[PDB]
Design a protein around this ligand. Structure first.
Ligand SMILES: C=CC1=C(C)/C(=C/c2[nH]c(/C=C3N=C(/C=C4\NC(=O)C(C)=C4C=C)C(C)=C\3CCC(=O)O)c(CCC(=O)O)c2C)NC1=O
Ligand SMILES: C=CC1=C(C)/C(=C/c2[nH]c(/C=C3N=C(/C=C4\NC(=O)C(C)=C4C=C)C(C)=C\3CCC(=O)O)c(CCC(=O)O)c2C)NC1=O
Lengths: 304, 304
């Protein structure tokens, strides 16, 4: 059971298209920072570690951001509007913050389509999607509607429903795809392809995204005394298992995204998506709309 | 069965806080217009009838609005951004358009909180709401969660779940309310309180809102030759039955909003809301978030 032993939740590094910070409470002093901060934020780790978050935030946005980070309803406040100011120039980010194992983690991803009406695309996506899912008359139609919808919103080359059986083996029961992607519909795979510790994690954190499998992991630096491993179980930017990156590579997949499907509190399956020849940095609104449809499908597994 | 006979779908008038227009296709010539247009739009019916819609729209917004109104996916494009320009001054509206009985109907409601991030409140409302509804372990908890959520979002003094029995009598099975509202929990009412033609309409159109029961109905004027009754079955501003306005008055209700709950294609119940001492012009994002939660609850009636 070597597969089941890799501690995927404490890799010590993140996917470098975003930045990860850890903040003290209540002061919001930065105790950790991913080392790709120069490229993404325009500041080095030395400038960041030990500094209060506010020193880097555009002032008209400072108070509210800080109030949100200190709030107990943090989970319901995401995404946070983070405007990072360095040398009189502003960079914009969606901040996604959460608390886990006593740490306050703030992940920053570059803001997309800043000219679009914010959240209008989420609004249409979940409204149109919900009606499509409600029209399904049975489990197969539900599965088909979901993959069609997710592929439509994301542009992924392939989207499937992967269903687990009683021994945790899986089966591709529905598939939507572009013609350039080989069909995986009907294939069954052994349980070890998604090992135990991964399934346990995916029962708790329902989303994972890997916009490119070729990336340099960015180590998370910390202040002296704060170097114990950082539990990234709920971190959107968590660097993923290298063994899994090889599996995608061998499968001919350049990018991936999956969403847990839950039933009676247990992992029932996944919505799994692949981009076969190119990257896929899915915008936040789209990604979150897909998670939402996943929750809806999960709620309907009891019925259909 | 006098109750069942009133033709509620062709009252010839609307609630005057919005404006209703009928547009020809494909030219978008205005063939009908509610007579409260001077107060709401700043133009008279004489100026409007027979004129093309574009003459009244701010030019940078004209092409897209017209393209949307001509689209077959109209239902998925609502709400429309309508900027009404009269004497160099702009007024802003959410346009809600639909097609029914061969007519293209455009309803205009003043845009609310224009400084808030558009659709951000819908995003949080349906995300937080969905998780609250999914935590319900049975039908009662589901009903309780829904009324608590709807009351929370709208500020209504009372929100209930009204469930129909086999002979179309109803029962108040869950209730959330402010202390100033009498409790209706547990009361049963005869079928005639929501007569047959109303129930049929509510199986098709899942939302109705009456922001004040004291209002002067605004007659819908039409060009000569176009004066047949206008079928307002799917019109948000449809003037409601005067008999029902008396029922609310006698019940001590100043404003109301209800949402159809559907199961197996049949009307199962309603989410009904009341404001006891004041009006209630519920913003579009909130109203639509509530309809959405209603659809979710309806989808879950099969399971719980
Ligand atoms: C069509 C079928 C299909 C399968 C089966 C599939 C497997 C799969 N394996 C995964 C993770 C994983 N897979 C593995 C490990 C292994 N994998 C192995 O084949 C072996 C031999 C090991 C180890 C001995 C690990 C460790 C993870 C966790 C990745 C992480 O979250 O860090 C994930 C989640 C991450 C993602 O969404 O890409 C999927 C979906 N994806 C698919 O679309
Ligand atoms: C707590 C209980 C409770 C009840 C029972 C209730 C009844 C009720 N009656 C309604 C419509 C109506 N009710 C009536 C008619 C009648 N009504 C009568 O008591 C009689 C005697 C007639 C006619 C003989 C009609 C015609 C409508 C349709 C209104 C419309 O859509 O135009 C509606 C939909 C409009 C709205 O949301 O306000 C409700 C909810 N509301 C509640 O909260």
């Amino acid at each position: 059971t070597n597969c089941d032993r890799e501690p995927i939740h404490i890799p010590g590094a993140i996917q470098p298209h975003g930045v990860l910070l850890v903040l003290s409470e209540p002061g919001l002093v930065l105790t950790h920072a991913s080392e790709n901060a120069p490229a993404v934020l325009g500041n080095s780790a030395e400038q960041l570690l030990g500094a209060p978050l506010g020193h880097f935030i555009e002032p008209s946005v400072r108070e509210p951001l800080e109030a949100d980070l200190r709030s107990a309803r943090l989970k319901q406040l995401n995404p946070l509007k983070v405007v990072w100011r360095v040398d009189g120039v502003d960079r914009f980010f969606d901040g996604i913050a959460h608390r886990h194992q006593g740490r306050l983690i703030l992940e920053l991803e570059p803001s997309s389509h800043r000219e679009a009406v914010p959240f209008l695309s989420f609004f249409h996506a979940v409204r149109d999607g919900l009606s499509r899912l409600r029209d399904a008359r049975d489990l197969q139609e539900l599965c088909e509607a979901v993959v069609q919808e997710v592929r439509g919103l994301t542009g992924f080359d392939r989207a499937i429903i992967y269903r687990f059986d009683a021994e945790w083996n899986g089966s591709v029961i529905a598939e939507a795809r572009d013609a350039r992607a080989d069909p995986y519909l009907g294939l069954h795979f052994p349980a070890s392809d998604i090992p135990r510790q991964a399934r346990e994690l995916y029962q708790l954190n329902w989303l994972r995204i890997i916009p490119t499998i070729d990336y340099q992991p960015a180590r998370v630096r910390a202040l002296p005394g704060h170097g114990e491993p950082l539990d990234l179980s709920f971190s959107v930017l968590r660097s993923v298992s290298p063994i899994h990156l090889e599996y995608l590579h061998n499968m001919g997949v350049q990018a991936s995204m999956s969403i847990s499907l839950m039933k009676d509190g247990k992992l029932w399956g996944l919505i799994s998506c692949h981009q076969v020849s190119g990257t896929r940095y899915v915008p936040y609104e789209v990604r979150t709309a897909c998670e939402f449809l996943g929750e809806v499908m999960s709620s309907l597994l009891a019925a259909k």
